[PDB]
């Protein structure tokens, strides 16, 4: 219960209803990224930058390959000795980790079998001349495979070429692969020094391919418009499950997660106003969102999660605790609430809520237009209530507000509450 | 008050000193942003993939109108029941809102004179053939047309197309649309969800138009030079006023604000120095910035506002209130100051103000470069002064310094204050 | 030192360990920025928009000139009359600064001889053609000399200048003026308005030259690979030293620094999970890193620096003092630490250290594989201990390990530990 008859008196007022959504199970596609373009139709001209250019990526390569290989021993090591059908991790060889980092070592090889699919097709993703390509796998799966440059080439240097020179294309082609290798650095840097823990989200990985995140879910099948609840929360994320050094090359399995509604969970909205207290002006301090789950109260940190129209989308279940003196004044006992004095203009004096106004009219002006004469509560009384009993339309600081009727006994009073 | 006097013994110093600026009243333009491109001369190449591009447009577009007709209806409901000059917001069929949400739903009904112009203009809009153009209203206001792939296509485009295939010019097209289609997903996003309640800044809505907001500024008749003070401090901002689904454009309102000094309103700024207590080191506890208006003390969160070389400007009055140890300690009572221990070499050992140094010559050398000779502090003092009576270049660390003189009625004493 | 023993019966349990690395001395290179560029290809097409360009961009200029000529007279007016072979700061002009702004007007006045080198080369830099271009000094020292648009006129216009109309021509180049001009203010604007103060990182200078900083450090004589260390850690920065108003160039130094590892300097990770009191779930609040030197414990803010596979790198020795609660429940008197009671499934249960597990098996499913039967903790124990004494493999959760053996004189024991 939230008590909200206690709370107007004394400026708290009912917002907005929300329901909850946390992430549910996955479904997955494969991508590769190449970073070793095919060249093939300005060859000539360009092999003394190229040449320099493998050299730098395959040194930038050869430390990711070294702790895939690595992690993927430790479960090796544990299958071959028992007869258990799960995969077993060795836990002596890791010597340490959290939880979720032995979870994601065993993720990692439960995956191994699309590695290896994808390595039996090496001089396919090769032979590709086009900027984005499908490919068929033999275990029947699709996969997507990007070349940008090769699709700058066919843009840029190729209707122009009878123009350039020799000394003129390969010059202009150098320039190009450096920044690129600097977009790759920036995009993937974290990955590629903790390739085990790290993940991607979309609309990131796009920053490779002009940021063009609509051709990637188009050509894996999906639409944007189809998958904006979980694309504008930003969980559609990939992970590196293999490299190859000596073709160039990056495999991320990507994710697209359903949503599961948490049954009997509500998360309520506070608005805040302030009050006359003697003549003085004061608030109240409460958090704007709280969570009740089968009558347990609880707090929520929305800043780490997505809010739209009508639900609270969170990555997992973000509940905290809360503390004996906020249980106390959410649950009637007003004289339990903190409060702050008032220095500034820009705190609100008044808030509409079930078709009925909560005003300050001792800090702002109030009048009834229907007689046109001024409101005026007592210095007894710290807020307001307008409702149509009295008259149809109101003013209320610079705004005019018609009203509806007050669903209670009698007179609505204010004198003299409790509070601390 | 601030008492420097007693403040300079505990290591607090007086720094520089600034005025206080908050928005004023505000002025208004027109802008257009197309989403559907005049393909008109690259028109029997590209059909498939523009017929596909524009059920796209419009399927994103239909949430978007009904949220303003929506919005409208609560306005026009009143508006046909009542005598008053005044516009009226219906309160039984809004049910819940804040202050805030009541004031932009009566500013969208205020603003719907100049969608109404717009929409007489529409086949006018339509035939644009270059990237940005401007037109006359019948209110005799001009308008802004922004068409961004329109200059693509006379950029990239024609210039070659004796030298493209057919097949080839489609497929090439195809991808800059997409592309479009991703850009204003990133910058509209948010706006396109709550139409009503959301603002976006000149920069933000310049990443449609590759980033030239110096453009748009000159084509509203202004000059970036000039508005220095309000671009830089981002004050200014655009909202959506209406949109037009088959033809498919989005109409915005954008505000320049003038800027209004506050009277009898002064920031200070205030620097921390370590200090000596019976042969330990120590630092005060105080925040950077404090706010004096008309005697009265208060804080001020400065995150929120920019700082330049003589004014604060922010985009409310920020003003919060101060507890009473602190506001005690500021005015001389200095045992109610709160003090911590130094454990790094970080913190700062001197500083200099009105010309002349103080340093805490316990924990840095401080000699005197005339005379060449060392000065010691007792272990009774907290805090050394110095000025040129005794000699007039000093050596304070690795930096040397001349100083000016104090203006007191003696030699100045730091022992044994009282502290807490 | 840290007692594990203690902490391990309350849920903390012991993690990664790192050595600590800072800042060292430094080492420059020298840079020039043309924001005027050289249109001597297509001169007589582009005249008028290039006229009222050149006229902004010494408008833009004009105010930072005289920041630097102010800071430069206040040194040259304490060398002129002193015998002194450093140079020396006129207090009294100054009249108020912090003790890193005395240091870095200091620096201003070291570097001005490199600034009357590269002054006395005005009419070789103004002369370049190209993108990138490398010169040579008086002082044996060479100038990196960049110049953006005349690479992309070379790109873009000269290939197809028989297609284009004089007036395509000057239309075109117009646009590109204003887009350049719209990126050096977001990238230069904070720095232009404090010379002296302000510090730019090469990811943020590359921004002026489509974002390729591999070019940038290749041209300097570095390979970005090398760098690794100091470049992901974002210690590479440069200031301004210079501005030559009628030719409209900006000239800086950059600075490329050592690391010094600190010695007898330890940083410890800790892990938390929950556990067991008389059938309720609690955690313990503890920070996740810890900063030991020479037995002193601290606390130090991670968030300000970069941890790699084996280091933390910070800028500087950001170390912070520890209150005696903290200290007394570290040091194993476990009724000083502070808890928390659980809500969310989110919080671990387990965790491995040594190749051990410890596990809370009130609250989540633990078996031994090897005799497939269930553990089971008494209501009087906190946590229990996994090793390989009972069985060499164990179901947690819904994750297998294989786990080592305990390193102590008899049985685990957690019943009744002292706590508050």
Redesign the interface.
Same mark, same amino acid.
């Given at each position: 219960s939230i008590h909200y008859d206690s709370l107007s008196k004394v400026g708290v007022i009912?917002?907005?209803t929300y329901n909850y959504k946390i992430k549910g199970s996955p479904s997955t596609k494969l991508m590769v990224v190449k970073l070793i373009p095919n060249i093939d139709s300005v060859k000539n001209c360009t092999q003394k930058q190229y040449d320099e250019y493998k050299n730098?990526v395959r040194?930038?390569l050869e430390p990711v390959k070294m702790a895939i290989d690595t992690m993927l021993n430790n479960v090796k090591s544990?299958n071959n000795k028992?007869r258990?059908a799960?995969?077993? $991790? &060795?836990?002596?060889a890791?010597?340490?980790?959290?939880?979720?980092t032995?979870?994601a070592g065993?993720a990692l090889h439960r995956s191994n079998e699309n590695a290896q699919a994808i390595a039996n097709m090496k001089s396919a993703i090769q032979n590709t001349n086009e900027?984005v390509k499908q490919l068929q796998l033999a275990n029947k799966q699709t996969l997507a495979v990007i070349d940008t440059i090769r699709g700058e080439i066919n843009?840029?240097i190729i209707?122009?070429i009878n123009?350039?020179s020799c000394d003129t294309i390969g010059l202009?082609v150098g320039?190009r692969l450096?920044?690129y290798?600097?977009?790759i650095?920036?995009a993937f840097?974290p990955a590629l020094?903790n390739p085990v823990n790290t993940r991607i989200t979309i609309?990131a990985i796009?920053s490779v391919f002009?940021?063009?995140?609509?051709?990637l879910l188009?050509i894996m099948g999906y639409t944007?418009?189809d998958l904006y609840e979980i694309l504008?929360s930003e969980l559609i994320r990939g992970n590196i499950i293999d490299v190859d050094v000596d073709a160039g090359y990056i495999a991320l399995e990507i994710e697209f997660p359903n949503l599961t509604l948490v049954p009997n969970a509500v998360v309520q909205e506070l $608005?805040p106003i302030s009050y006359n207290i003697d003549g003085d002006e004061w608030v109240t301090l409460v958090p704007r969102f709280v969570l009740t789950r089968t009558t347990?109260l609880?707090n929520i940190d929305t800043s780490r999660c997505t809010i739209?129209?009508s639900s609270v989308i969170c990555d997992?279940?973000? &509940?905290?605790?809360m503390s004996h003196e906020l249980i106390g004044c959410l649950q009637g006992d007003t004289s339990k609430c903190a409060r702050?004095?008032?220095?500034?203009?820009?705190v609100?004096?008044?808030?509409?809520?079930?078709?009925? @106004?909560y005003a300050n009219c001792l800090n702002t002006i109030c009048r009834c $237009?229907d007689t046109d004469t001024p409101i005026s509560q007592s210095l007894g009384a710290t807020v307001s209530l307008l409702d149509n009993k009295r008259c149809s339309?109101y003013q209320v600081?610079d705004?005019?507000?018609? @009203?509806?009727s007050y669903l209670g006994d009698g007179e609505y009073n204010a004198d003299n509450v409790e509070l601390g």
């Open positions: 009912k917002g907005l730098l040194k930038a544990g028992y258990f799960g995969a077993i $991790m &060795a836990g002596v890791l010597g340490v980790a959290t939880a979720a032995v979870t065993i900027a843009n840029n209707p122009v123009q350039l202009s320039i450096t920044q290798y600097s977009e650095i920036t840097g020094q609309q796009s002009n940021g063009n995140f609509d051709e188009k944007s418009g504008h $608005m347990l609880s739209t129209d997992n279940d973000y &509940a905290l605790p702050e004095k008032v220095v500034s203009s820009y609100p004096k008044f808030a509409l809520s079930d078709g009925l @106004v $237009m339309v600081g705004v005019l507000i018609s @009203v509806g």
